[PDB]
UniProtKB/Swiss-Prot annotation, chain A:
Cellular compartments per GO CC: cytosol; extracellular exosome; extracellular region; ficolin-1-rich granule lumen; membrane; nucleoplasm; nucleus; proteasome accessory complex
Annotated keywords: Acetylation, Phosphoprotein, Proteasome, Repeat
Source species taxonomy: Eukaryota, Metazoa, Chordata, Craniata, Vertebrata
Organism: Homo sapiens
Leader peptide range in chain numbering: none
Ranges for the PC repeats: 336-369, 370-406, 407-441, 444-478, 487-516
Biological processes per GO annotation: proteasome-mediated ubiquitin-dependent protein catabolic process; regulation of protein catabolic process
Protein name: 26S proteasome non-ATPase regulatory subunit 2
Quaternary organization: Component of the 19S proteasome regulatory particle complex. The 26S proteasome consists of a 20S core particle (CP) and two 19S regulatory subunits (RP). The regulatory particle is made of a lid composed of 9 subunits, a base containing 6 ATPases and few additional components including PSMD2. Interacts with RPGRIP1L. Interacts with CRY1 in a KDM8-dependent manner.
Phosphoserine PTM positions: 11, 24, 292, 294
Swiss-Prot record, chain B:
GO molecular function, one term: identical protein binding
Entry's localization field: Cytoplasm; Nucleus
Ranges in coiled-coil conformation: none
Organism: Homo sapiens
Modified residues (Phosphotyrosine): 152
Matches recorded under PROSITE patterns: PROTEASOME_ALPHA_1, PROTEASOME_ALPHA_2
Protein's name in the database: Proteasome subunit alpha type-7
Gene that this polypeptide is encoded by: PSMA7
Function: Component of the 20S core proteasome complex involved in the proteolytic degradation of most intracellular proteins. This complex plays numerous essential roles within the cell by associating with different regulatory particles. Associated with two 19S regulatory particles, forms the 26S proteasome and thus participates in the ATP-dependent degradation of ubiquitinated proteins.
Effect annotated for changing residue 152 to F: Displays impaired G1/S transition and S/G2 progression
Curated annotation (Swiss-Prot), chain E:
Full protein: residues contained: 47 to 84 of 433
Quaternary structure and partners: Component of the 19S proteasome regulatory particle complex. The 26S proteasome consists of a 20S core particle (CP) and two 19S regulatory subunits (RP). The regulatory particle is made of a lid composed of 9 subunits, a base containing 6 ATPases including PSMC2 and few additional components. Interacts with NDC80/HEC; this interaction is detected only during M phase. Interacts and SQSTM1. Interacts with PAAF1. Directly interacts with TRIM5. (Microbial infection) Interacts with HIV-1 Tat.
Family assignment from sequence similarity: Belongs to the AAA ATPase family.
Function summary: Component of the 26S proteasome, a multiprotein complex involved in the ATP-dependent degradation of ubiquitinated proteins. This complex plays a key role in the maintenance of protein homeostasis by removing misfolded or damaged proteins, which could impair cellular functions, and by removing proteins whose functions are no longer required. Therefore, the proteasome participates in numerous cellular processes, including cell cycle progression, apoptosis, or DNA damage repair.
Induction notes from the record: Expression is not cell cycle-dependent and occurs throughout the cell cycle.
Entry protein name: 26S proteasome regulatory subunit 7
Organism domain of life: Eukaryota
Organism name: Homo sapiens (Human)
Subcellular location: Cytoplasm
From Swiss-Prot, chain F:
Pfam families according to UniProt: Proteasome, Proteasome_A_N
Protein role: Component of the 20S core proteasome complex involved in the proteolytic degradation of most intracellular proteins. This complex plays numerous essential roles within the cell by associating with different regulatory particles. Associated with two 19S regulatory particles, forms the 26S proteasome and thus participates in the ATP-dependent degradation of ubiquitinated proteins.
Tissue: Expressed in fetal brain (at protein level).
Protein source organism: Homo sapiens
Induction info: Up-regulated in colon cancer cell lines. Up-regulated in fetal Down syndrome (DS) brain (at protein level). May be the target of the transcriptional activator NFE2L2.
Entry protein name: Proteasome subunit alpha type-5
InterPro entries the UniProt entry points to: Ntn_hydrolases_N, Proteasome_alpha, Proteasome_alpha-type, Proteasome_alpha_type_5, Proteasome_asu_N, Proteasome_sua/b
SMART domains (alphabetical): Proteasome_A_N
Length: 689, 239, 370, 248, 31, 228
């Protein structure tokens, strides 16, 4: 109707006209009024007036909430103590209490730091449990633990909307936009409601982000309570890091309850179903052995081809293909070929000893040292290959068993990940105290103790890596030491959630840009990735640093950091000119499934002229795809047809055919512009089943 | 060779208007018909009462004799003329040999008339297809259908009009051996056919029965509501 | 509330897009180039470092090439860089990116992917293994040694998803897409169809492996116009040129040719034979069950109450399409903004149902039949 | 495309001449009959209202056909004469054969068959004429029927002519009546329908025509009523328009 | 405000990353 | 052009008769073989629905007590021709107290197989196989829509008649026996059909001079099927 009968009712100040007009306005409050509430300029004078004055607070929050305010709007509701499935309930509850209580939670969440906003917050939580459309109420009620009692208060009936919808969008947006400390509340209260619930790989991805040891005991009494079985042994062992299968095999070495979790969840039963079934359902032919194994000769390309043939795995045929192929081979390639029988067969525990045993203790140092390297390759649960190598290791400067130290300290780094294995590190004290002029002694020292030490409890600054810091800064020689020791330093820094070890090594370490490059290595490895863009604008500024190798690793951190929100991962690094930066993006594509935009970047990155960068393209190019596939390969044949390029092409052919185990060895590969002695360890980036 | 005329073939051996006149039937109202063992029953859909007139004149199910029952599809005028002729044919047959008229002879008459009507010079063929149900020889239930070409074609159940493939496909999944009789199950079979109809509006259903000895019985829209209620009860019992 | 980030990211995108000596040999090559670097067109190429060009008005010269940019870039029928002082060929010009490319070569993966189907999951698998599997993963043709199937025909009732599947293959793509509506192939001149055919499929064959999609190709056999010179004895010539184009010579190339029709009866039997088209594909109106999937998808991003059963919209009409269900959704939205609500109720569906079945499916004024 | 004759079909299967006969119907005079017991009515619009006529026929669309039946008509006017003479001859043949008045339904179907025989046969012009039916019988009482050029016939209670009467049928549905057999009420309703549907400003009585049929004691007379009661009907309906503007 | 937040501030972090790179930026063959 | 029965071609010919011969091809197949022991004959039914009652579709009809028939093409033209033959046979027995021989039957049918005329209607669309036993033993007779009637020893018609005639001339000679010709025919049937051969697909019609009555086999045909 017209506002002529109802409009001058705001003019009197008598109590009965208010106490019946406000219930009369409550009936018309289903649409608020006729219109956009142009009573405001006349009824804002009624502020100073004071029985049913909380109903006057309802009118006042109704009209101030009706037009616009950020702090004075929820003040009549916090003064009101709301009192006295509907359209009106959707109005004053849904949009008005959602937006109004939302700005009260934001304004007091940023302002003060009461219980009133907790009571209103639980009331709105209950009202949106009535409304039952989550998603927006949830993401609003994150920013007020509050979210803990919100989840256990909310979770009674609906499982997959809160679990799938809430835990999907808030897990992804929590690692994406939100900082870290509330993600622990996600993980613990999600451990509560998922502890109530079935389909346990939600809790196993909670074990992925948590890395908790109680969780695997609860999910093994519960996932033994739910008797597939060896398959969750498989992605259990794939999912788990270095620590919790050794803590798991020690507390389950105590209890075990059927001993089949000691069978599955240490080793050997992720791997017993696969390799026969790998032979069975797949049938791989011979003309890539012969054709791709025919790609000419030259003891390099041929040597690489042995590696390519070797990583073929239809039987361990290229293993037992005669003799005179390794006799053509030379020292560090003899390491690569002695380890290549390791690479053909990362299973066959009993067959590993009886195949490598001919090449064990042979006439050649590289055959025996790469042979124990192969013993470290083939398995990770044997630990009886240690002692024939372990006993020999000491040489005190540069004898044979230091190369067995390289293959056996590295291959034993492949072998075990304990709570903290300490006996092998007490063996590692005369290794770094030995300090051979061979790089990969301290190389596989840092990398191997890092593989022992990735997933440490927020890292540690213990005397192991503290000792290799002090003995690192002891000798400033052969800067590959100053690169690959901060490798294993940052590997021990992995396992962090909140580590101040960048500040600790910042105080101990920093100097002339060898150890400032150690500073940027700890800066890389301590910062795995979250919504933490301040180090990304730090990346923007110190990306322009005149020393152009802290540029290399510091800009190289990007594929670790933004690996999930990968749409921003295309950047203009190719549009820059510091050619190692084009190398950095060339790393940053990598190996996943590799969409058309990535191969489109390999359109330009495929065509470059420097042999380390033209060498650098087919590696990640054929890692990212594990004609179509062979079309860029024959395009590389069109590129060259140097020797490096030929080797790079061979590597690409090999490629053609946050788990830390796939995170380490390519950052171990990042110093490739060097000797084949370095490439003798190039075959230790064991990141594929 | 062309859609005109009826007299010349296609170059690949077809008649266009014979093939095209069936489309008028195929866009027509749906009418089904099954045979029981003792009681035969059928019905049309799309009564389509337009709120201001009577519908006792639009009845698509009639009879020529007390023993035979009708249905059709396509356009209504050809059905009017064919049935008005067929009544006189039935009565002329009765004026001859004193039997109750067999369903087979009158179907041969109707399809034969339709065909020799088609063969002639420029006569538009009757775009209908009739359903001719009777049980004459010791109460042997028979139902034949016709065609615009004029081919009588004996079935056990039948479905024509709009969406006849789906409606006949329901009878493929419905018509087991032990349908009838079991007259109540034949009743529920007609009810399930009406529920499986293209619209199944519930009040636009019009069905007529014959117990092979009685007369044609038009049912009531309260018995059918009970039938839909017990069919929904069977659907709930499936749950 | 998302307008802030939208506007800020849009402005940042535009400003970063608008963000676009040391070398003396390059400057010497600059000085070998003229200051008025004129532009010409080639006729023939002679091996003796110089070839014949043509000017704008038609003067022609034997002029040599600045050889740091390659002459293998040069083909007969290209636009080049010429000098004024000896008119020498200076370098390669980027080509005339003609309006055939800017119209037809759609750069954009248009809309929703294979989760926008209804009643599919065999024909998706057919078009997948006939186009995508020859495109993305043709390692199985190594494994056996067999030709991929060539041509695809989409046919059925109007509103079935010919348009939808055409947008679907152009969504998941890595090759250059071309699109032609079949009514374009008659112009107001004598002999313009074969020129369109040759230039169209030449541009299709020149860039890359590609996909040519043409739709409503039946609009050339059963259509006449007063805007037509010659007539059937030029329609037949257009058909015959496309006939030689499709099943011709010289290793046609990795250009998947996909066609889509409403009717199928009025088409050339010489064009539905294999060699040309190996995978004819039926589009029937599939089932009364995936009606609910199209109601699910086309209401997956609109707030709606429960208040309805899709079985009420299954037992209403006998022919089913996405053209039915999307019309129901849009008319329900019209009835929603007509009654200024959200969370669309049942009466909008009922009035939308009746008004959409009437407009249009009835045929014809009563009566007939009835 | 597939035009030429009435026979044979166009490939849908649809028809050519039935549709075009209805589109020939639509540009003609508007008529109606109403729901009434104890009587029934007919209305008609005067075509060609030019002042130099005579109106000495008393009936231009109405044809009192047998005794107790009249028929309105619409369409091609000479074919109406052709059909009405034959229809009187059919009714009079029935009376000759049985000495009973014709009960109107077999009469309607007979005329529909006469039209339909020209629909099937070829090549003949089908009658582009729809026409109404009022009448009385021994079996149903007062009746209403709608003939069509297809040969289909509809039993109505409120009837339909073409483009000038689709809005009339809309008003007949929106202002539907049932239970009232009072003839003056239905006459006021018909006056309202012709007042809105005809474009005649203020409804001059020379442009209208009304015929009724009542049952009187054995006789079933047909009343072609005169002009003065039409005049006072107009004044009554305009007094009802004053009653309608009482809400202002 | 979950996916809204996600798209909005992720593209904003992208644009802010691009802004400091837009600011950080500032033959013999036959002659 | 060619537009009607009253216009020749520049080279021949009709050009309506040709389209009738083309309209032979759409039908289901049928095979008859003349053997001096008696005429055997077969057909395919091509049943669509299980509701489609199989004994209702007629392919072998009975004209005389020793004369069979089989039809191929339009059903109702064939029904008209069968009706006329059923009339005319009875008139021949009427006026002569004897059986009209099957060649004379076919002359009587082919008298107006082409009497097609719309003024002074269309030609018919069916080819017919006639089997019978006259005084000269059994007779197997093959006509056409064009009335060009000739005797055939083992004729096959309809769809897939080419390879049927091919494999038929592969197996046929003059001195065949009965059941051998029966199984030889049904082999060709299950080579040209698309469905599994069973009791409902085909039907046989066997006439013998000593077994003149009952030119049919009912469900012993099952036993004949299971012997292959």
């Amino acid at each position: 109707r017209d506002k002529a009968p109802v409009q001058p009712q705001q003019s009197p100040a008598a109590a009965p006209g208010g106490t019946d007009e406000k219930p009369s306005g409550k009936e018309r409050r289903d649409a608020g009024d006729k219109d956009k509430e142009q009573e405001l300029s006349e009824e804002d004078k009624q502020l100073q007036d004071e029985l049913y004055r909380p109903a006057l607070e309802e009118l006042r929050r109704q009209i101030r909430s009706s037009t616009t305010s950020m702090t004075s709007v929820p003040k009549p509701l916090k003064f009101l103590r709301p009192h006295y499935n509907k359209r009106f309930a959707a109005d004053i509850i849904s949009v008005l209490a959602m937006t109004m209580s939302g700005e009260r939670e934001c304004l007091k969440y940023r302002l003060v730091g009461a219980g009133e906003v907790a009571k209103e917050w639980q009331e709105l939580d209950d009202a949106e449990k009535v409304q039952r459309e989550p998603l927006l109420t949830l993401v609003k009620e994150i920013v007020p633990l509050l979210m803990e009692i919100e989840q256990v208060d909310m979770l009674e009936k609906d499982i997959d909307e809160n679990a799938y919808a809430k835990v999907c969008l808030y897990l992804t947006s929590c690692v994406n936009y939100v900082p870290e400390p509330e993600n622990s509340a996600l993980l613990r209260c999600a451990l509560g409601v998922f502890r109530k619930f079935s389909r346990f790989p939600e809790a196993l991805r909670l074990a992925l982000m948590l890395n908790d040891m109680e969780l695997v005991e609860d999910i093994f009494t519960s996932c033994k309570d739910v008797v597939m079985l060896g398959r969750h042994g498989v992605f259990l062992e794939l999912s788990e890091d270095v620590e919790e299968y050794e803590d798991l095999t020690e507390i389950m070495s105590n209890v075990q309850l059927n001993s089949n979790f000691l069978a599955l969840a240490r080793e050997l039963d992720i791997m017993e179903p696969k390799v026969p079934d790998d032979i069975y359902k797949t049938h791989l032919e011979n003309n890539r052995f012969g054709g791709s194994g025919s790609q000419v000769d030259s003891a390099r390309m041929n040597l690489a081809s042995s590696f390519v043939n070797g990583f073929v795995n239809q039987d361990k045929l290229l293993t037992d293909d005669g003799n005179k192929w390794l006799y053509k081979n030379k020292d560090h390639g003899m390491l690569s070929a002695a380890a290549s029988l390791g690479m053909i067969l990362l299973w066959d525990v009993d067959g590993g000893l009886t195949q490598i045993d001919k090449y064990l203790y042979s006439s050649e140092d590289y055959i025996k040292s790469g042979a124990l390297l192969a013993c470290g390759i083939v398995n990770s649960g044997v630990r009886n290959e240690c002692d024939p190598a372990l006993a020999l290791l000491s040489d005190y400067v540069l004898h044979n068993s230091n190369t067995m130290r390289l293959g056996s300290i590295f291959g034993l780094g492949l072998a075990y990940a304990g709570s903290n294995r300490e006996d092998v590190l007490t063996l590692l004290l005369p290794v770094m105290g030995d300090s051979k002029s061979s790089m990969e002694v301290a190389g596989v020292t840092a990398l191997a103790c890092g593989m022992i030490a990735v997933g440490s409890c927020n890292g540690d600054v213990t005397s192991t890596i503290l000792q290799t810091i002090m003995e690192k800064s002891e000798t400033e020689l052969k800067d590959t030491y100053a690169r690959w020791l901060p490798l294993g330093l940052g590997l021990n820094h992995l396992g962090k959630g909140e580590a101040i070890e960048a500040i600790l090594a910042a105080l101990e370490v920093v100097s002339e840009p060898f150890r400032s490059f150690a500073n940027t290595l700890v800066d890389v490895c301590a910062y795995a990735g979250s919504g933490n863009v301040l180090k990304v604008q730090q990346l923007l500024h110190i990306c322009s640093e005149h020393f152009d190798s802290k540029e290399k690793e510091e800009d190289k951190d990007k594929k670790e950091k933004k690996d999930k929100d990968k749409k921003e991962a295309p950047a203009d690094m190719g549009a820059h000119q510091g050619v190692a930066v084009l190398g950095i993006a060339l790393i940053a594509m990598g190996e996943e499934i590799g969409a058309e935009m990535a191969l489109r970047t390999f359109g330009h990155l495929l065509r470059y002229g420097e042999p380390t960068l033209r060498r650098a393209v087919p590696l990640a190019l054929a890692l990212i795809s594990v004609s179509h596939d062979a079309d860029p390969e024959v395009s590389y044949n069109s590129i060259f047809a140097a020797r490096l390029a030929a080797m790079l092409r061979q590597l690409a052919q090999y490629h053609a055919k946050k788990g830390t185990l796939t995170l380490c060895p390519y950052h171990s590969d990042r110093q490739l512009m060097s000797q084949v002695a370095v490439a003798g360890l190039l075959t230790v980036l064991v990141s594929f089943l | 060779s062309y859609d005109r005329a009826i007299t010349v073939f296609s170059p690949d051996g077809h008649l266009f208007q014979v093939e095209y006149a069936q489309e008028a039937v195929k866009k027509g109202s749906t009418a089904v018909g099954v045979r029981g063992r003792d009681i035969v029953v059928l019905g049309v859909e799309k009564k389509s009462v337009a709120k201001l007139q009577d519908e006792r004149t639009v009845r698509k199910i009639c009879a020529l004799d007390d023993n035979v029952c009708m249905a059709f599809a396509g356009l209504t005028a050809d059905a009017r003329i064919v049935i008005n002729r067929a009544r006189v044919e039935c009565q002329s047959h009765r004026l001859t040999v004193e039997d109750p008229v067999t369903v087979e002879y009158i179907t041969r008459y109707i399809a034969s008339l339709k065909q020799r009507y088609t063969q002639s010079n420029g006569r538009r063929p009757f775009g209908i297809s009739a359903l001719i149900v009777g049980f004459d020889f010791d109460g042997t239930p028979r139902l034949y259908q016709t065609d615009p070409s004029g081919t009588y074609h004996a079935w056990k159940a039948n479905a024509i009009g709009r969406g006849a493939k789906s409606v006949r496909e329901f009878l493929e999944k419905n018509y087991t051996d032990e349908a009838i009789e079991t007259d109540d199950l034949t009743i529920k079979l007609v009810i399930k056919a009406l529920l499986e109809v293209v619209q199944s509006g519930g009040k636009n259903i019009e069905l007529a029965v014959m117990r092979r000895d009685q007369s044609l019985k038009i049912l009531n829209p309260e018995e059918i509501e009970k039938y839909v209620a017990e069919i929904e009860k069977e659907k709930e019992e499936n749950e | 509330l998302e307008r802030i980030k939208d506007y800020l990211l849009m402005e940042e995108e535009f400003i970063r897009n608008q963000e676009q000596k040391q070398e003396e040999e390059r400057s010497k090559v600059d000085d070998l180039r003229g200051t008025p670097m004129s532009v010409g067109t080639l006729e023939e190429i002679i091996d003796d470092n110089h070839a014949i060009v043509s000017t704008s008005v038609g003067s022609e010269h034997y002029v040599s090439i600045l050889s740091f940019v390659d002459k293998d870039l040069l083909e007969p029928g290209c636009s080049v860089l010429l000098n004024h002082k000896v008119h020498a060929v200076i370098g390669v010009l980027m080509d005339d990116t003609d309006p055939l490319v800017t119209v037809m070569k759609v750069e954009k993966a248009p809309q929703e992917t294979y989760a926008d189907i209804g009643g599919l999951d065999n024909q998706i698998q057919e078009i997948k293994e006939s186009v995508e599997l020859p495109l993305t993963h043709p390692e199985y043709y190594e494994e056996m040694g067999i030709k991929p199937p060539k041509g695809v025909i989409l046919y059925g009732p109007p509103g079935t998803g010919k348009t939808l599947l055409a947008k679907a293959v152009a969504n998941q793509t890595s090759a250059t897409f071309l699109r032609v509506v079949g009514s374009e192939l008659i112009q107001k001149y004598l002999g313009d169809g074969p020129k369109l055919v040759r230039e169209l499929f030449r541009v299709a064959e020149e860039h890359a492996p590609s996909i040519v999609f043409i739709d409503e190709i039946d609009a050339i056999g059963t259509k006449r116009y007063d805007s037509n010179s010659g007539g059937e004895r030029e329609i037949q010539r257009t058909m015959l040129e496309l006939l030689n184009q499709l099943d011709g010579f010289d290793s046609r190339g990795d250009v998947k040719v996909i066609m889509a029709t409403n009717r199928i009866e009025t088409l050339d039997p010489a064009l539905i034979r294999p060699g040309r088209i190996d995978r004819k594909i039926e589009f029937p109106l599939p089932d009364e069950k995936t009606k609910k999937r199209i109601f699910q998808i086309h209401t997956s991003r609109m707030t709606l109450a429960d208040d309805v059963t899709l079985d009420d919209l299954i037992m209403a009409k006998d022919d089913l399409s996405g053209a039915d269900i999307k019309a129901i959704c849009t008319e329900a939205g019209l009835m929603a903004l007509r009654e200024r609500r959200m969370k669309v109720t049942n009466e909008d569906f009922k009035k939308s149902k009746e008004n959409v079945l009437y407009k249009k499916q009835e045929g014809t004024p009563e009566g007939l039949y009835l | 495309r597939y035009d030429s004759r009435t026979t044979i079909f166009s490939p849908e299967g649809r028809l050519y001449q039935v549709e075009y006969a209805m589109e020939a119907i639509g540009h003609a005079g508007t008529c109606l009959g109403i729901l009434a017991n104890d009587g029934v009515l007919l209305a008609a619009e005067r075509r060609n209202i030019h002042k130099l006529l005579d109106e000495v026929f008393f009936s231009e669309k109405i044809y009192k056909l047998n005794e107790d039946m009249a028929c309105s008509v619409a369409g091609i006017t000479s074919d109406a004469n052709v059909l009405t003479n034959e229809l009187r001859l059919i009714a009079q043949r029935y009376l000759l054969q049985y000495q009973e008045p014709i009960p109107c339904e077999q009469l309607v179907t007979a005329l529909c068959d006469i039209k339909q025989a020209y629909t099937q046969f070829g090549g003949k012009r089908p009658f582009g004429v729809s026409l109404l039916y009022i009448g009385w019988d021994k079996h149903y009482g007062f009746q209403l029927y709608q003939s069509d050029p297809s040969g289909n016939y509809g039993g109505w209670k409120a009837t339909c002519i073409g483009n000038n009467s689709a809005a009339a049928v809309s008003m007949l549905k929106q202002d539907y009546k049932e239970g009232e057999m009072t003839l003056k009420s239905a006459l006021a309703l018909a006056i309202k329908v012709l007042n809105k549907t005809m474009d005649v400003s203020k409804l001059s009585a020379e442009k209208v025509e009304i015929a009724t049929l009542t049952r009187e004691n054995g006789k079933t007379v047909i009343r072609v009523l005169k002009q003065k009661e039409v005049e006072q009907l107009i004044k009554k309906h305009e007094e009802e328009e004053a009653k309608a503007e009482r809400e202002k | 405000q979950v996916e809204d937040d996600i798209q909005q501030l992720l593209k904003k972090i992208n644009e802010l990353t691009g802004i400091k790179e837009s600011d950080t930026g500032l033959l013999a063959a036959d002659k | 052009y060619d537009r009607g029965v009253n216009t020749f071609s520049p080279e021949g010919r009709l050009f309506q008769v040709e389209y009738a011969i083309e309209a032979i091809k759409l039908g289901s197949t049928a095979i008859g073989i003349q053997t001096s022991e008696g005429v055997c004959l077969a057909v395919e039914k091509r049943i669509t629905s299980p509701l489609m009652e199989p004994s209702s579709i007629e392919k072998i009809v009975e004209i005389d007590a020793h004369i069979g028939c089989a039809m191929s093409g339009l059903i109702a033209d064939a029904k008209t021709l069968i009706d006329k033959a059923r009339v005319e046979t009875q008139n021949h027995w009427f006026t002569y107290n004897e059986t009209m021989t099957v060649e004379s039957v076919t002359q009587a049918v082919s008298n107006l197989a082409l009497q097609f005329g719309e003024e002074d209607s269309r030609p018919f669309g069916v080819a017919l196989l006639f089997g019978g036993v006259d005084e000269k033993g059994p007779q197997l007779f093959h006509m056409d829509p064009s009335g060009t009637f000739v005797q055939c020893d083992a004729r096959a018609i309809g769809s897939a008649s080419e390879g049927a005639q091919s494999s038929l001339q592969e197996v046929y000679h003059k001195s065949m026996t009965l059941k051998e010709a029966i199984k030889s025919s049904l082999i060709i049937l299950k080579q040209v059909m698309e469905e599994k051969l069973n009791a409902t697909n085909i039907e046989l019609a066997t006439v013998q001079p000593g077994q003149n009555f009952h030119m049919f086999t009912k469900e012993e045909l099952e036993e004949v099927i299971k012997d292959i």
